[PDB]
Amino acid sequence: NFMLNQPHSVSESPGKTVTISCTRSSGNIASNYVQWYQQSAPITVIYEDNQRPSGVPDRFAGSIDRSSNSASLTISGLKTEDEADYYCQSYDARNVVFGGGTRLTVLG
Amino acid sequence: NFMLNQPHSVSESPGKTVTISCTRSSGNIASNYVQWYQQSAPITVIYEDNQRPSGVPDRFAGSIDRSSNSASLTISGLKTEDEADYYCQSYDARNVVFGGGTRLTVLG
């Protein structure tokens, strides 16, 4: 299978843009859909690489970078409310794979 | 105890073979298992000299050279995602030791 690796921490000031990356260790990041959860239980903020569920602010964006074999969650216009852990997730034909999660600290 | 020594930096173009070596300063390199970590927290890419954990691509290979009292991590067919800090690690009857690390840059 594979693992997904993310930094544990990222920080930024309100109004600014932050990116959390999720590197896949083996295989192609493009081969399976990537979901992002914010953490109660984790809630979905991105699914199928870049789709936002109902209610999730447009400031949350998912992307895939095949060249670095990674997925990224980019949060623009950072709000205090966005402080949370964010986990990426994908699949290896059945079994769920989870990143280690990244804490977004919002400065101020 | 001992110290482990690796060159600061290795440069190589994509698709080629890079070797990063780790020399033990005292005692037998064979006497204790060598682990390699890729760096978020270190994650194991080689353990017990030459074992790849699940998720680690076959292009990564660990080896021991008793004739140079060294351990080596060899990466065939380089990829840009492989850009990281690489550290070796072994034991000295209890306590543990890390190499200074090696930056693999992928050129072009």
Strand A9-12, strand A102-106: pairing: parallel
Q: Nearest CA to CA, how far is B83 from chain A (Å)?
A: 9
Long-range contacts at A41-50 (CB < 8 A, ≥ 24 apart)? A42/A85, A42/A87, A45/A73, A45/A86, A46/A73
Q: Residue A26: how many CA atoms within 13 Å on its side-chain side?
A: 15
Strand B18-24, strand B9-12: pairing: unpaired
Q: Under 8 Å CB-to-CB from A18, ≥6 apart: which residues?
A: A10, A11, A12, A74, A75, A78, A104
Nearest to B79 by CA among A99, A89, A23: A23
Contact A101, A39 (CB under 8 A): yes
Structural domain count, chain B: 1
- Between CA B87 and CA B92 the distance in angstroms is 17
Give the technique used to solve this structure. X-ray
A69 with B56: Cβ contact below 8 A: no
DSSP H or E segment with residue B22: strand B18-24
> Resolution of the deposited coordinates, in angstroms?
1.6
- B interface residues, A as partner, C-beta within 8 Å: 40-41, 43, 54-57, 79-81
CATH number at residue A63: 2.60.40.10
DSSP secondary structure string for all residues of A72-99: EEEE-S--GGG-EEEEEEEEETTEEEE-
Strand A70-75, strand A4-5: pairing: unpaired
B41 with A6: Cβ contact below 8 A: no
- Which domain range does residue B79 map to? 1-108
Nearest to B3 by CA among B104, B103, B74, B87: B87
Q: Residue A92: how many CA atoms within 13 Å on its side-chain side?
A: 13
DSSP secondary structure string for all residues of A47-70: BTTTBPPTT--TTEEEEEETTTTE
Residue B14 dihedral angles phi and psi, to the nearest 5°: -50, 145
DSSP H or E segment with residue B37: strand B35-38
